[PDB]
Scaffold this active site. Structure first.
Site, mmCIF file in Angstrom:
data_model
loop_
_atom_site.group_PDB
_atom_site.id
_atom_site.type_symbol
_atom_site.label_atom_id
_atom_site.label_comp_id
_atom_site.label_asym_id
_atom_site.label_seq_id
_atom_site.Cartn_x
_atom_site.Cartn_y
_atom_site.Cartn_z
ATOM 1 C CG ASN C 38 0.237 -6.021 7.230
ATOM 2 O OD1 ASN C 38 -0.749 -6.290 7.962
ATOM 3 N ND2 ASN C 38 0.990 -4.983 7.410
ATOM 4 C CE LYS C 192 -34.530 -1.285 -8.677
ATOM 5 N NZ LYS C 192 -33.148 -0.874 -8.337
ATOM 6 N NE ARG C 194 -30.097 -0.586 -4.262
ATOM 7 C CZ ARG C 194 -30.251 -1.853 -4.665
ATOM 8 N NH1 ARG C 194 -30.616 -2.789 -3.799
ATOM 9 N NH2 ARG C 194 -30.057 -2.179 -5.935
HETATM 10 N N1 LIG Z 1 -20.533 0.416 -3.589
HETATM 11 C C1 LIG Z 1 -21.787 0.090 -3.284
HETATM 12 N N2 LIG Z 1 -22.159 -1.214 -3.274
HETATM 13 C C2 LIG Z 1 -23.429 -1.519 -2.968
HETATM 14 N N3 LIG Z 1 -24.419 -0.702 -2.608
HETATM 15 C C3 LIG Z 1 -23.998 0.576 -2.564
HETATM 16 C C4 LIG Z 1 -22.733 1.045 -2.881
HETATM 17 N N4 LIG Z 1 -22.665 2.428 -2.716
HETATM 18 C C5 LIG Z 1 -23.874 2.755 -2.307
HETATM 19 N N5 LIG Z 1 -24.720 1.676 -2.215
HETATM 20 C C6 LIG Z 1 -26.105 1.623 -1.736
HETATM 21 O O1 LIG Z 1 -26.960 1.678 -2.838
HETATM 22 C C7 LIG Z 1 -27.786 2.866 -2.732
HETATM 23 C C8 LIG Z 1 -27.966 3.454 -4.103
HETATM 24 O O2 LIG Z 1 -28.865 2.618 -4.858
HETATM 25 P P1 LIG Z 1 -29.618 3.276 -6.112
HETATM 26 O O3 LIG Z 1 -30.868 3.934 -5.628
HETATM 27 O O4 LIG Z 1 -29.588 2.272 -7.224
HETATM 28 O O5 LIG Z 1 -28.664 4.486 -6.546
HETATM 29 P P2 LIG Z 1 -27.481 4.287 -7.621
HETATM 30 O O6 LIG Z 1 -27.960 4.980 -8.864
HETATM 31 O O7 LIG Z 1 -26.153 4.855 -7.082
HETATM 32 O O8 LIG Z 1 -27.470 2.777 -7.765
HETATM 33 C C9 LIG Z 1 -27.064 3.771 -1.734
HETATM 34 O O9 LIG Z 1 -27.939 4.684 -1.089
HETATM 35 C C10 LIG Z 1 -26.495 2.743 -0.767
HETATM 36 O O10 LIG Z 1 -27.472 2.311 0.157
HETATM 37 N N1 LIG Z 2 3.809 -5.288 6.495
HETATM 38 C C1 LIG Z 2 4.475 -6.423 6.707
HETATM 39 N N2 LIG Z 2 3.942 -7.350 7.552
HETATM 40 C C2 LIG Z 2 4.649 -8.465 7.781
HETATM 41 N N3 LIG Z 2 5.840 -8.812 7.303
HETATM 42 C C3 LIG Z 2 6.325 -7.893 6.457
HETATM 43 C C4 LIG Z 2 5.724 -6.690 6.126
HETATM 44 N N4 LIG Z 2 6.516 -5.973 5.241
HETATM 45 C C5 LIG Z 2 7.563 -6.751 5.057
HETATM 46 N N5 LIG Z 2 7.513 -7.929 5.780
HETATM 47 C C6 LIG Z 2 8.477 -9.031 5.777
HETATM 48 O O1 LIG Z 2 9.169 -9.030 6.997
HETATM 49 C C7 LIG Z 2 10.608 -9.097 6.772
HETATM 50 C C8 LIG Z 2 11.206 -7.750 7.136
HETATM 51 O O2 LIG Z 2 12.450 -7.910 7.884
HETATM 52 P P1 LIG Z 2 13.710 -6.918 7.616
HETATM 53 O O3 LIG Z 2 13.251 -5.690 6.891
HETATM 54 O O4 LIG Z 2 14.868 -7.675 7.060
HETATM 55 O O5 LIG Z 2 14.058 -6.532 9.117
HETATM 56 P P2 LIG Z 2 12.876 -6.158 10.126
HETATM 57 O O6 LIG Z 2 12.353 -7.502 10.594
HETATM 58 O O7 LIG Z 2 13.634 -5.321 11.165
HETATM 59 O O8 LIG Z 2 11.836 -5.356 9.380
HETATM 60 C C9 LIG Z 2 10.757 -9.538 5.306
HETATM 61 O O9 LIG Z 2 11.841 -8.932 4.607
HETATM 62 C C10 LIG Z 2 9.521 -8.916 4.668
HETATM 63 O O10 LIG Z 2 9.159 -9.618 3.509
#
Ligand SMILES: Nc1ncnc2c1ncn2[C@@H]1O[C@H](COP(=O)(O)OP(=O)(O)O)[C@@H](O)[C@H]1O
Ligand SMILES: Nc1ncnc2c1ncn2[C@@H]1O[C@H](COP(=O)(O)OP(=O)(O)O)[C@H](O)[C@H]1O
Ligand SMILES: Nc1ncnc2c1ncn2[C@@H]1O[C@H](COP(=O)(O)OP(=O)(O)O)[C@@H](O)[C@H]1O
Ligand SMILES: Nc1ncnc2c1ncn2[C@@H]1O[C@H](COP(=O)(O)OP(=O)(O)O)[C@@H](O)[C@H]1O
Ligand SMILES: Nc1ncnc2c1ncn2[C@@H]1O[C@H](COP(=O)(O)OP(=O)(O)O)[C@H](O)[C@H]1O
Ligand SMILES: Nc1ncnc2c1ncn2[C@@H]1O[C@H](COP(=O)(O)OP(=O)(O)O)[C@H](O)[C@H]1O
Lengths: 312, 308, 308, 312, 308, 312
Positions: C38, C192, C194
């Site tokens: 986290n 092209k 893809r």
């Molecule tokens: N965030 C992304 N990162 C990488 N590839 C992606 C992402 N989102 C979509 N794609 C892939 O790339 C393809 C689109 O490629 P392309 O034909 O170049 O279209 P665009 O114009 O969106 O690039 C999608 O069909 C998918 O397979």
């Molecule tokens: N999502 C999380 N995952 C792990 N540890 C976290 C997360 N959020 C906060 N913590 C940490 O864990 C502790 C929280 O304990 P506290 O709030 O005092 O009592 P409790 O242990 O009952 O939650 C530290 O204060 C905080 O930094």
């Protein structure tokens, strides 16, 4: 939840054909314009807990049709519809999809937000100008393809033995390639330039068109400026003849005169926009496909399955 | 945050008069229609961190002007305006304020929501059709009163000695009674009911009008159907003469012909809507009043020590 | 409202170069991972009523960097920042811009909404994969162009006399044609499609490349699959030599090996992503350009007189 | 989706009568006030995927009843109700509908927003103080009319052969005219002035009341200040007698004493507010009409059809 | 943006003490009840572009005070305040922080949402019943600590040499252990469980209290049921004497009679709630601390270098 | 509305066991990671008008699992699901529930807001770190208790005649007391201190543990730091032996080594997190309880009734 279909003033004939294809009457609604040019909408009967579908295309007068749609969606939610779908067969403002100048509206996104504010739960549309416009909506969008209806048209009209699909612009290659694969045709590209607005120059050709039946396809025909240039370029490159098709036959300003003057054999478009009368104009009805999509939205069946992968 | 004023196509003359009253230029913005009747707006210069005021009245073509306003608000926020005010001198859809039939839009409320969605931070407006329309907005509204310019018009233009102010509608009396009070006059009112967009039926007339000069004051004059019927009903009741004033001179369809034909002596309205020339029509400019309100909004000074 | 700059773990060197260009320190913030993987973020000093800029690129580990950005935006608003800008030099998920198969996320739009929900008031970014991604944001986006630094790189580094700029993709031409126009060169493009994350098929080559020095310009280089296939296709077509530039040098998986192996002479990219050393790789810093844009956003001066 | 009805503390007898008219039990919920005057609500049984209707009128103590309603709507959504309707038979804050002074709350709109935030999907109400208050809600509002029940009351109580409907204020003409048309009666207006808070002066009369049974109708009776003035004016103009009716019998402060002292024959109001005991007070139950509206909201039938156009 | 302070009817004395500490007048606002028990609020002067702070504690009548706060926030935004802070010295409904039975309201969260809907931009508060209630707000919350005024009270008022601080509840220990740490004392705690609004059962006592002066520190004292049972349980366990302090002296129903009757020597609380006079009750004013926090919020200075 | 269940990559075995317990297949979805470490989700078949439940626990890699969940919820709404529930058996960020330092994120609330933005309609979870985390969600939350499953485990494993439940921290008394009441056991408290990180000092004991089978219970075991200290303290106070249980067996960093080294007899946890292999580790499956809750959410039956009040 009864299925209920209504129409704005833009394309009542398409709305009527959709209802008829569902075996349903077109719902009764009135739109008035007061002397002050303000609009008024009213549903004549209850649509309470209805699955309501409102048909409106963005054709002239566009802003009256946009406001009528916003007001019919609003009034439907206000009259306790269960669900309201904006059926927008032609979404003209999909062209307003980028900030290509400083300090403009990305009007396709603004209109998505306005439809959502008015109370739209969903959109049903066909051939968006750009596919990124889908991501301007937070509400679900069913985006229908005209690919099968346009490929069917050509398969029934032209000599496939001697045909080629031509893209006249880089942006047209993807839609042209899909058509080519569906008809089993070669794909060509024609790089042309409007030099002296009466002449267009063929810079480059890749593939062959000489003595061939050239097919061109676009998302829309507005002024027919791009259709005319491509046809002139293709006849200068020695094409036998040119058939053109688009989803949206918007046909504004000089389009009809330009098509009559062009050597283009025929120009086909769907009825997302009300067809205009012309000797070489053909209509490809999408009322049955919208009716099937609406039926499937209503019943929770697969709209995606309507995109067939048939090859001619 | 620099004060910046812009205009839609509805009322550039009023916007220009507002800018001039502030000692500022009217900001440069383009609106055009594509061949397919789609609108396009563009601000020609930066309005970044601007206190942006956009002037648009709801006059024909009303849906084009509504959309041009929504698009100008949206583009101003997208161009990093610090604050965006929709200056709407005339809000026509304030008349769509109730659900008087089933399954209609309360369109005043819808448009308030569309203006908020487009990115409006505030509204500046004058003489809403009903005061409740203020409650259709979540964002702040400065609601200006025409009462000072209308009071001043009657005080100097008509004989007051035998005058009565007439409310042409029984539901909307606060305006006529405040004007009656301000001019030291008595009050009559008409109980109407609308038959159509262009026709009204006078069901009752309350107060003393016999042989009096009657001063009709209304929010707006659209078709002038309510005005000429109220004048017909006052003359029929024995009024000597009738004068009228309204904030919003909308003057559509048969209005100018109906006023010219009516025995009404004169009809005054503000320039919230671009005035239409007519022999019996007078313009009461509210440009200075909108300018003073904008300056005050800009600077954080009291607007109420004018308005409402 | 004091100007305050902070960095996530993605690109602290670029953030530091931006801060130095503004004459400011890089603000102190802690990011740590608990034993359970986290994340935890903390601003070490007050940023109350601050104009807060948070620098994070979408580079591996991308989901940790996305979450660290969301948490830094959220904590800045919770610590009473006056304004919070997400400075995202490289937005990888701009590639997820369409519904090209049923029942997927349009992840660019989802992330725009998550950034808004976390409390971002604005975005500053460079070379979005597609210009439409600007429309996925309701909050204002300043979208910077790499064209000036890429133009300058080719103008001084390669022989121009027999050169052509090549768009490696037919759908995205505005960038290649504006660079072609700016260098006074002709234009070719590759059509092209893809095949996989790591492989592309060149279906067509348009324009004259025979015996020319080809200048590939792209938004990004990820696996370098599209780059080396475009180079293979240009050399096969008879190009003399190929040079390439992109904004985003992402350089993942087989990229550096593929470039080193390819006959491409040189590959330039900006530092939106931390550069990876390679003999044929060049860095074009955009720190000064991000600093100038931040100063202008801060002061309310024109950013367009640089950008896009 | 089971139909489920609950009540706050404001008008449990109306809520109980509504449930009984639906053939349903009143749902079990408890509201506690801790020693620190904080409220606590709890539904004793599951209302999961229920169509839940919560009855609360804005009667004293008003802010405890507003908060109880907000908390019952909240708790219903939190307990996974399918749909939550605020049944608000009397919405007192509809009077706070305009900015008639600088720097006040338009409290009817604020409360609409608070109900929506709490999780209300819908409102069911009767006789809003002004019809524009409908537009303060984004969620659907079913606005019931008392016109048929009030006209029925008079038709069963008074000599229609010798009756006239009188508006004592310009704002009262529309509601008075509707009653007049329903009973086939003439409509009169009485312009009066409270001069010395013990005397009221008749300035003008239009129509005839002399020797007639005058009928007056209002949306509500709070302090009976306007009822008293009209009755005194009408007896000074030589009316035989005066019968008064309203939707909302709020009856606060001096109302009961003023009505006993007034020559008014009888004062009728619905049970949107719990009736108060008085010799000349009559109750017109709207439990059956709210029950019918709820039945129709639940089943998706026409609530608008409940507005009958019958003439006596 | 001028600093403006206003009060509801809950605690005008504390608001007045805050205004005086800032060297400002308490702003003029009217609250009245109509005959029908409906509330009405009005600001008597402009607060346009004001940095507006509205003081209201959740004391009887609590729903009237909640509604008066919501209406004052709403009307301040409607009157074009630049920023509106709900200063809530005592938030009673912080006790409604969990779903400890099915089909209840988590009323602390509901009220956070109502305050946001009404238009609150921020909250200033002191000693929330549980620290998690901070997470019920999307808008920023400055959460002030009473620990300094309570530490100072015990340090000077009681013999420390044989003292222990007692947490009257095992779930809420951070407050007692931080006070124990600050006074250099050991720590005991009571494991209770609530039987009713007015009665608690002590299930276990942990730590060494025999013959010690026990210092009870709690968030609030409502009915004093938990206080007198903890005192009964400490004396039964052999404590020499008991003193108590809490932030919120709510003192409802049988509280003052229960404290007067209990062997507890003294009971200190702040003025977050209007103090009630009693021989064994002491007031620790937090007006200066709220004033310092408001000044710091107004100016954008560190509040943490006081709070929490 | 079909009931449809899908899984992210975090706990496919739990998701699979839940589907099987419902008599349903696990829905088909793919998650890819591109070379650039970006994620991609896709539903292989229609879930249109489905009641869709997506299972994901916050286990390493946590941010990839958070983003996968956000993207699967988003994609489900985008593919026209009727309803989307986030089934989050272990919500690790519930620990990030307060502002215990200046200028941090209350990450449990931020994630609630992100899930709502992504389009979650509801959450189904078990043993939140603090019960106030329920109020970080605006959408309904069904919060399941592990109390009955943990008490059953001990009743089947230990000598109840000679057992005591021990809280080793003030915060553990409420959960320990519930277990004690369910098993009819005395409750003890052990005040201990880690002095020299190898020794822990017993400051105070209330109740008796000498020669007794001590039971300890927690919401979660992460690093086993608190489990180890309590067991060491309890053996120093002369306990015969120690059995430990928790809902969430997170088992990160040194946990497995520490448990093997500790004299603790056995450590039981549910499968909200995928179990890790260890000689003294036992699994208490909650697949049947999540399946029953999902069945009841889907059908509108009482989830609250699943909290039994049985005493051993
Ligand atoms: N965030 C992304 N990162 C990488 N590839 C992606 C992402 N989102 C979509 N794609 C892939 O790339 C393809 C689109 O490629 P392309 O034909 O170049 O279209 P665009 O114009 O969106 O690039 C999608 O069909 C998918 O397979
Ligand atoms: N999502 C999380 N995952 C792990 N540890 C976290 C997360 N959020 C906060 N913590 C940490 O864990 C502790 C929280 O304990 P506290 O709030 O005092 O009592 P409790 O242990 O009952 O939650 C530290 O204060 C905080 O930094
Ligand atoms: N925006 C509008 N422009 C013109 N007429 C309208 C508008 N909205 C509604 N109307 C019409 O005017 C009628 C209302 O007229 P009227 O009785 O004067 O009520 P109001 O007080 O709203 O003016 C409506 O029933 C409708 O027929
Ligand atoms: N706003 C409130 N005012 C007074 N008592 C309340 C309030 N909200 C809840 N309660 C009551 O107090 C109980 C909680 O008491 P307690 O066990 O101290 O838990 P907490 O930690 O929330 O105080 C609730 O179960 C309920 O009976
Ligand atoms: N809604 C619209 N209707 C008509 N033309 C529009 C619209 N929106 C933008 N345009 C104009 O059409 C052009 C858009 O072309 P461009 O975005 O370069 O490629 P494409 O033609 O593929 O959209 C001009 O840039 C733009 O001004
Ligand atoms: N909720 C309310 N309850 C009682 N009186 C109210 C309420 N809201 C406003 N008022 C007062 O009642 C009057 C409202 O009358 P006004 O708006 O002029 O006409 P109407 O009596 O038709 O509403 C005073 O202006 C206003 O202060």
């Amino acid at each position: 939840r009864p299925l209920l279909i209504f129409s704005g003033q833009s394309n009542r004939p398409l709305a009527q054909a959709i209802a008829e294809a569902l075996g349903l009457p077109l719902g009764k609604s009135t739109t008035l314009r007061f002397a002050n040019d303000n609009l008024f909408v009213r549903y004549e009967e209850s649509l309470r807990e209805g699955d309501v579908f409102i048909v409106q295309s963005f054709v002239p007068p566009v802003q009256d049709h946009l406001m009528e749609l916003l007001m019919m969606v609003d009034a439907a939610k206000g009259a306790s519809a269960a669900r309201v779908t904006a059926v927008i067969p032609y979404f003209s403002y999909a062209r307003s999809d980028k900030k290509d100048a400083p300090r403009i509206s990305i009007t396709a996104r603004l209109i998505a937000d306005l439809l959502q504010t008015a109370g739209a739960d969903r959109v049903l549309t066909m051939t968006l100008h750009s596919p990124q416009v889908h991501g301007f909506f937070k509400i679900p969008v069913d985006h229908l393809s005209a690919e099968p209806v346009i490929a069917n048209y050509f398969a029934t009209r032209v000599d496939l033995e001697n045909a080629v699909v031509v893209a006249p612009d880089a942006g047209d290659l993807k839609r042209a390639s899909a058509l080519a694969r569906r008809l089993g045709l070669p794909l060509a590209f024609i790089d042309k330039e409007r030099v002296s607005d009466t002449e267009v120059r063929v810079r480059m050709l890749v593939g062959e068109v000489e003595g061939k039946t050239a097919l061109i396809v676009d998302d829309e025909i507005s002024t027919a400026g791009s259709l005319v240039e491509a046809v002139e370029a293709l006849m200068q490159a020695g094409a036998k003849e040119v058939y053109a098709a688009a989803t949206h036959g918007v046909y504004v300003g000089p389009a009809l005169d330009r098509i009559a003057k062009s050597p283009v054999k025929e120009v086909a478009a769907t009825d997302t926009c009300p067809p205009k009368e012309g000797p070489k104009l053909r209509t490809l009805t999408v009322a049955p496909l919208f009716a099937e999509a609406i039926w499937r939205i209503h019943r929770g069946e697969s709209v995606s399955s309507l995109f067939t992968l048939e090859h001619h």
